[PDB]
Ligand binder design. Structure first.
Ligand SMILES: *[C@@H](C)[C@H]1/C(=C/c2[nH]c(/C=C3N=C(/C=C4\NC(=O)C(CC)=C4C)C(C)=C\3CCC(=O)O)c(CCC(=O)O)c2C)NC(=O)[C@@H]1C
Ligand SMILES: *[C@@H](C)[C@H]1/C(=C/c2[nH]c(/C=C3N=C(/C=C4\NC(=O)C(CC)=C4C)C(C)=C\3CCC(=O)O)c(CCC(=O)O)c2C)NC(=O)[C@@H]1C
Lengths: 183, 183
């Protein structure tokens, strides 16, 4: 019968639930919006795992340039001066990545991605209680879940304060949303 | 300048985040869909708190009938036979609420809501570890968060198995979504 039409919305409703409630769908939607809004050739999310691994988990490329999605690496150590900056929730403006000494090794990765300049915006979990790893601070009582990056590949783009100021405000809203959807 | 247009999407993006991530917005949207789909005059969510309190937290009424939103009560005890049924994740079809012995006291509430017949669908949290209250089971290792109800007020409506079968499938999808958004 038309008991058939009962389930053409249950598959809708279940769709909206699993949609809104899995993290990746709201990563892939935010990133797509940051990309279109800042007219940036690439937006990525760099996920930092405590064991030392780290992977590009979402990316939204201008089709001109490579897909660095899923790109990865183990035992990721960052420079202490850099991590102090990102722990305080401050972004980073890298107006020339190729002569940036902190990204002096991601030159394979730099040259493929075609990155000239970029803004790096930390994503911070207020994680209290007991957890410790490679990306966790005792001074600032927060863990660095990962990093929202924006890539300017076609030109050595100059960035404004309120462009980075803005980015960080968007990551800081992912910090909250991620603390929620981890099971 | 047009730095103005930077923030006419940050207020958008923040909107989608706080939207999708607060529980009530996805309660109020599901209930509105259950109402329109089953052509029921009222849909409510009965929230059961462990201390004994209990309140109608969402409701979507056919404007003809009262707003039982926010309706409430303390030290809510249910009949043991009834709770056993709901713990196993089984709905309940009350084809005549007025001579239902289990709802023999909600007759103030019955007479205002104009309820003739109704389907009650439990919402179950797989909550392990250590928590105990008035709505928690050791036999079934699950807590009764609350209850999705549908009200047939204009007529003593007859319900189908796949109407209740269906309801329960929708609550069971809220069970998962709620376990996620509790901070
Ligand atoms: C070299 C000085 C050290 C380092 C720098 C560093 N990396 C990032 C962020 C990223 N790290 C990677 C991945 C890699 N780490 C590697 O060591 C290698 C191999 C060469 C790879 C491929 C990636 C993809 C990123 C994100 C880069 C991006 O901009 O899209 C940072 C943080 C961001 C920044 O530029 O400030 C830094 C400082 N990481 C190390 O492990 C080296 C000791
Ligand atoms: C009376 C036998 C007992 C009882 C029955 C019972 N109530 C519900 C669900 C609801 N309980 C309320 C609220 C009230 N509980 C009260 O004791 C009073 C005062 C009279 C109120 C107002 C509400 C709003 C509900 C939801 C009702 C709905 O159908 O919309 C149930 C579960 C649902 C069912 O009908 O099977 C039951 C069994 N609860 C008690 O506390 C009494 C001992």
């Amino acid at each position: 019968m038309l008991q058939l039409q009962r389930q053409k919305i249950i598959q809708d409703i279940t769709q909206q639930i699993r949609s809104t409630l899995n993290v990746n769908h709201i990563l892939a939607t935010v990133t797509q919006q940051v990309k279109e809004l800042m007219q940036v050739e690439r937006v990525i999310i760099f996920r930092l795992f405590p064991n030392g691994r780290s992977q590009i988990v979402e990316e939204v490329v201008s089709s001109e340039y490579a897909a660095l999605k899923n790109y990865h690496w183990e035992d990721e150590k960052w420079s202490q001066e850099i991590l102090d900056c990102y722990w305080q929730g401050k972004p980073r403006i890298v107006p020339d990545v190729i002569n940036d000494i902190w990204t002096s090794c991601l030159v394979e990765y730099t040259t493929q991605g075609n990155i000239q300049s970029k803004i790096v915006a930390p994503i911070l979990q207020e994680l209290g209680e007991n957890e410790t790893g490679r990306w966790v601070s005792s001074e600032h009582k927060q863990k660095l879940w990962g990093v929202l990056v924006v890539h300017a590949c076609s030109t050595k783009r100059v960035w404004e304060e309120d462009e980075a100021q803005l980015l960080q405000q968007i990551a800081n809203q992912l910090a909250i949303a991620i603390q929620q959807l981890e099971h």
